[PDB]
Amino acid sequence: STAGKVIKCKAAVLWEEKKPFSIEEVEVAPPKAHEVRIKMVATGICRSDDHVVSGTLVTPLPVIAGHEAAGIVESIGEGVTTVRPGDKVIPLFTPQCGKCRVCKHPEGNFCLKNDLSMPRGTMQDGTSRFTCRGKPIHHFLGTSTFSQYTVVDEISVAKIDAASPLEKVCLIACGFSTGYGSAVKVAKVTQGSTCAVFGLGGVGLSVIMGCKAAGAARIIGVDINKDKFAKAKEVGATECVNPQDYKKPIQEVLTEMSNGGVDFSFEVIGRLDTMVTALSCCQEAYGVSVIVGVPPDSQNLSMNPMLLLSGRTWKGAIFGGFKSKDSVPKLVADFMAKKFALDPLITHVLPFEKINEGFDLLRSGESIRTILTF
Amino acid sequence: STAGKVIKCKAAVLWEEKKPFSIEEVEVAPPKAHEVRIKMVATGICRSDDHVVSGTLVTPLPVIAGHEAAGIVESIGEGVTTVRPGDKVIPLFTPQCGKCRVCKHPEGNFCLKNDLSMPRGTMQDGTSRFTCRGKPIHHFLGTSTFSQYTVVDEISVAKIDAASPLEKVCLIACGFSTGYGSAVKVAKVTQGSTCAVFGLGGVGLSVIMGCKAAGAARIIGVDINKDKFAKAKEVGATECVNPQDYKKPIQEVLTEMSNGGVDFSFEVIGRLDTMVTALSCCQEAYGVSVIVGVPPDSQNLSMNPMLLLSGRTWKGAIFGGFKSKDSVPKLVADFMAKKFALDPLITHVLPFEKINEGFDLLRSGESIRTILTF
């Protein structure tokens, strides 16, 4: 039995920026009241985890990163009602407390209990459950999935189908749901529309999936890496364009291709310049542009507000707009019912011990999602 | 008797930026095919007209400005089907051609025949109907209402009720419709919501009227001129704040006052800084901010896209999102039926000949709308 005891297990600890993960032994405290300790089964490598390594995203170090995962409940703290030992679960990097003004709002999902805006790198109670070589180690987004065991607050965990294949459904924890929801829920892509998707990684491919599911007639993929185009077409892109092939700025190309601007555009990269390009390429009177990519820390963009005065809508979202604890089980159920596919996103499956090799595949351009198996 | 003849009449010609208008004789050509010549009855002074004088808004000079007006058809050119001589009409500064992709779209209003995006200062055919001192004079937004007679393209005029009081309904040509539609159509303000309105001139008072019509529970008016607060409360503001009274930036003050951000904010001034402040003060996960104010020519704002990534929606609109030719007659019908009030916006009345005094009143901060009578 491990319940009520400290677990010594393996984890990938990030001690400082721009260094490899250190795979080593950590101690994982048992869960306190309203907390859940989870044996991890599979975790994806999302670009947002690479942002913590690169310093694009600031969060307290040292840290156990990782936020796109699934596993099995090992134990529950006092007062937990929503999961039990042995349940398949997904940690939620955006919590759903159910009590805050956002949780109560029909269109809100960015729960005020989140650890994104102003990251503390702790549990809800402001403490850490992790130590390594006698030092406290920070949590990441209330999840910390690069560990054989994690501890999460109840509001940051969802119970899923006992028959779920966790090596696939872990992508519902971030990249699939974010892209799909950005198209179907945040943009509300319409039947017959023309869409432009900037960035053809795991999240951008999931935006294409959503645009196709919503009945878009044209879906133009934009990436500087033409190796990304074949899989973008497989999942629904009708055309792909590489900005580097053109003398004109790509906003002009896309406005020309779409006979005066697209209905919906998506920025799924994380660059200030492409956020402005994507806004510009949507039709000036009724276009909608959605920012999905995470910008670099503390940098402002420059834009001409006449782009909005003509009638454009500009919005962004975390996690595809989905209220996390309500949505994740339904998405897993939809997957089980063959409503969408996840295999197109998975290009590599590695043991957890090869986390660094997984990140090198992402940085080199080769991979979409690497799944790590514990 | 004047049909098919040049008309000599008085107009207010702007020869140079930052100068008074010159009230002097012009020659107004008869209408060509699908053109309408109109005897003006009343015109409002909108801050956008002043922007032409200040250079905030760049359009070719010399010019006959004015865009907020009503008048009576003097004659129609060949092929005109939608108005006749003796009809009461409102010139439409945003046309409705009914044929372009925007006119066809259910939510579009910024018709591609507009002269706002890249002003030429002409009729649709690229020529002028105005001569002064033997020199061609520019049109403005295809309206040019600061003249006893003007000529407009058919797609830039709407027939209105024959019993209309033109000295009131001229405000449906810009300021009222813009502010009211920005609330009810563009933002879609909800019952019980909290709104913040930056700028309490004629357009921002119209935004308040729309927010109140839509059922908002709290409407916070924001102006640096506290003399504007009594009228804002009369038309529905629940409280007014002057940024100059506070040590902290007003986005922080409004976030505190609204227990975490407002539902809907409106920038109704034309400043880059207040456009950012207005976005920031709406709730970060589900807030909506609407740009109404006209920015200074060719200047970019700076903002942090994290404001959007959390869930905010940012949009702008021309003319309250109204399809102009469909909507203007209906708005006049609704005014006739007492569905909204215009008198709260009218603070001064002058003869056309006292146009310069009317602009002095706006610049001093004393007026909301001055109505000039021909």
Ligand SMILES: NC(=O)c1ccc[n+]([C@@H]2O[C@H](COP(=O)([O-])OP(=O)([O-])OC[C@H]3O[C@@H](n4cnc5c(N)[nH+]cnc54)[C@H](O)[C@@H]3O)[C@@H](O)[C@H]2O)c1
């Ligand atoms: N909003 C959310 O909740 C959320 C969720 C998940 C991911 N993200 C962010 O979404 C972005 C994409 O994540 P991902 O799909 O895992 O990353 P990824 O797999 O690195 O994909 C990014 C793609 O952008 C391409 N690219 C890079 N520069 C350009 C350019 N200048 N023009 C066009 N294409 C370019 C690049 O070749 C790559 O295929 C990252 O910034 C993530 O941090 C946000």
Ligand SMILES: NC(=O)c1ccc[n+]([C@@H]2O[C@H](COP(=O)([O-])OP(=O)([O-])OC[C@H]3O[C@@H](n4cnc5c(N)[nH+]cnc54)[C@H](O)[C@@H]3O)[C@@H](O)[C@H]2O)c1
């Ligand atoms: N989008 C459209 O279709 C449309 C239509 C009509 C007017 N406009 C624009 O809307 C704006 C307002 O027009 P209006 O109501 O006729 O003008 P106005 O009467 O000049 O009202 C502007 C108000 O803003 C106030 N103000 C100025 N600076 C600040 C500040 N820093 N903070 C708070 N309040 C401030 C000022 O005291 C005044 O009461 C102008 O920029 C117009 O050009 C746009």
Ligand SMILES: OCc1c(F)c(F)c(F)c(F)c1F
């Ligand atoms: O990929 C999801 C994701 C985000 F969208 C962020 F905005 C963020 F800060 C982060 F850490 C993260 F993991």
Ligand SMILES: OCc1c(F)c(F)c(F)c(F)c1F
């Ligand atoms: O007041 C309406 C109005 C606008 F909203 C503009 F954007 C513009 F350029 C202009 F000239 C105008 F008159």
Ligand SMILES: [Zn+2]
């Ligand atoms: Zn919450």
Ligand SMILES: [Zn+2]
């Ligand atoms: Zn992610």
Ligand SMILES: [Zn+2]
């Ligand atoms: Zn049109």
Ligand SMILES: [Zn+2]
């Ligand atoms: Zn105006």
